[PDB]
From a paper:
Our approach focused on modifying the lactose anomeric position with aromatic amines, yielding a series of N-aryl-N-lactosylamides. Based on this initial screening, compound 3r was chosen as the most promising early hit, showing the greatest improvement in affinity toward Gal-3C (K d = 41 μM) along with reduced affinity toward Gal-1 (K d = 860 μM), thereby achieving a promising 20-fold selectivity in favor of Gal-3C. Analysis of the binding mode revealed that the lactose scaffold binds in the canonical position in subsites C and D as expected, while the 3-carboxyphenyl moiety resides in a receptor region defined by the backbone of residues Trp-181, Gly-182, Arg-183, and Glu-184. A hydrogen bond between the carboxylate of 3r and the backbone NH of Glu-184 can clearly be detected. Additionally, a crystallographic water molecule appears to mediate a network of hydrogen bonds involving the carboxylate and OH-2′ groups of 3r together with the side-chain carboxylate of Glu-184, potentially further stabilizing the binding of 3r. Reflecting the crystallographic observations, a charge-assisted hydrogen bond between the carboxylate group of 3r and the backbone NH of Glu-184 was detected in the simulation, likely accounting for its enhanced affinity compared with 3a. Among these, tetrazole 3y was able to match the affinity of 3r toward Gal-3C, while 3z and 3aa again both showed a reduction in potency. These results demonstrate that a negatively charged carboxylate or tetrazole group at the meta position is crucial for increased affinity toward Gal-3C, whereas attempts to replace it with a neutral group revert the potency back to the level of the unsubstituted phenyl amide 3a. Structural analysis of the Gal-3C binding site revealed that the second meta position is favorably oriented toward the backbone of Trp-181 and Gly-182, making it a promising hotspot for modification. The binding pose of 3r from the X-ray structure was used as a reference representing a bound conformation of the N-aryl-N-lactosylamide scaffold in the Gal-3C binding site. The m-carboxyphenyl amide 3r still exhibited mostly disordered behavior; however, occasional ordering into the X-ray-like pose was detected (2 of 30 frames with RMSD <2 Å).
Author numbering: 113 to 250
Amino acid sequence: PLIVPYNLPLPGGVVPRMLITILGTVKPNANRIALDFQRGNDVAFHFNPRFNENNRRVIVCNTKLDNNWGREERQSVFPFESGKPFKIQVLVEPDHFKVAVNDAHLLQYNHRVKKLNEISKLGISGDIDLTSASYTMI
Ligand SMILES: CC(=O)N(c1cccc(C(=O)O)c1)[C@@H]1O[C@H](CO)[C@@H](O[C@@H]2O[C@H](CO)[C@H](O)[C@H](O)[C@H]2O)[C@H](O)[C@H]1O
């Protein structure tokens, strides 16, 4: 297994057709999960399942530029479950990140950070046991 928070280098940055696969298990009584695709200090794509935001489960997605969070994009489909194993697949497409969880399409996130070559690492954090994190080309 992998220590969380975990950094996955993305050598040479992201490109369309790159597929990131993450396997893990949500801890009991989880509060949050986060994926942070980073361009230096900036967060090109933040994907943040929140298990209890005012008694609602929601995924928040956003971008952080110069330490400022932008406009949140929120999705109430919520495919994660405390205590249970999951698979996240993030496919880089030309104009968005496309995310599927447990083989079902979840959401798309339009590229705000357009220098995809410079998005050179992925941080994986939160209330999970992390089994594996890797990438391939499709
Ligand atoms: C205005 C306000 O209180 N918040 C906010 C900030 C930026 C964008 C929106 C929006 O589009 O509705 C709202 C809240 O600001 C906090 C602090 O930045 C947010 O929490 C942060 O959210 C980012 C992702 O956006 C990230 O997960 C941070 O880790 C987290 O602290 C909160 O969600 C906003 O409601």
